[PDB]
Structures are given as structure tokens and as C-alpha cells.
């Protein structure tokens, strides 16, 4: 459902946006794998990069929203990121177009 390089959806405020994994975090080797640009190897956090606290300590991916910026670009937890299937677009429009 969440691969590395995958399209998912992600909620960004109250509403849901398109979106690219391009990292994802393993809360207990503390090491995310990483789009290329093993083969793909498990690699720890950067010396200035960093995962909020809030979702550390759980699944994580970085993701890039489709159309923003790159500065956008930001770590998600489960709480945050759906999977790009039907019912969760119709759930993205309905929020956009009906509340």
C-alpha cells in the first residue's frame, strides 16, 4: 500500500492533497530507506535532518506533495497519510467539495 517511490494521499490541514513517498523511516533501527537518483540500503537520519517528535517513534514518510514546492517536503505519520485507492479519493473530493 505505501512503497518507496508510490503515490499515496496525504492530509495537509483539513484537507487532502496527492502525493510521492520518497523516504520511509523505521522507528526501531532508526533508519530510513531512500529514493535513489542490498541497492537500496537502510540509512540513518542526516547530521541536520530530522523527524518531528510527535511521529519518531512510529512508521514514518517523507513525502513530496504533487504540484508544491520541494520546501513543502515533509515526514508523516499513519495519522496523516491514505492510500491512493478509491474510497480515499472520493474521501479527498468530498472534504474539498462538500465539507
Known amino acids: 500500500e505505501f ?3 508510490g503515490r499515496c494521499l496525504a ?5 487532502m492533497y496527492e502525493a510521492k513517498i520518497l ?3 523505521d522507528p526501531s533501527s532508526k533508519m530510513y530507506t531512500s529514493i535513489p537518483n542490498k541497492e537500496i540500503k ?3 537520519l542526516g ?3 530530522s523527524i518531528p517528535e510527535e511521529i519518531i517513534n512510529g512508521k514514518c514518510f517523507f513525502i ?7 520546501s ?3 515526514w508523516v505519520g499513519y495519522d496523516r497519510i491514505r492510500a491512493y485507492n478509491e474510497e480515499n479519493i472520493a474521501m479527498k473530493k ?4 462538500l465539507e
Open 94 to 97: 468530498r472534504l474539498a467539495n
Open 42 to 44: 537502510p540509512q540513518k
Open 3 to 5: 512503497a518507496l517511490g
Open 72 to 74: 513543502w517536503d515533509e
Open 11 to 15: 492530509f495537509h490541514g483539513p484537507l
Open 64 to 70: 513530496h506533495y504533487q504540484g508544491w514546492k520541494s
Open 47 to 49: 547530521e541536520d535532518e
Open 23 to 25: 523516504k520511509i523511516w
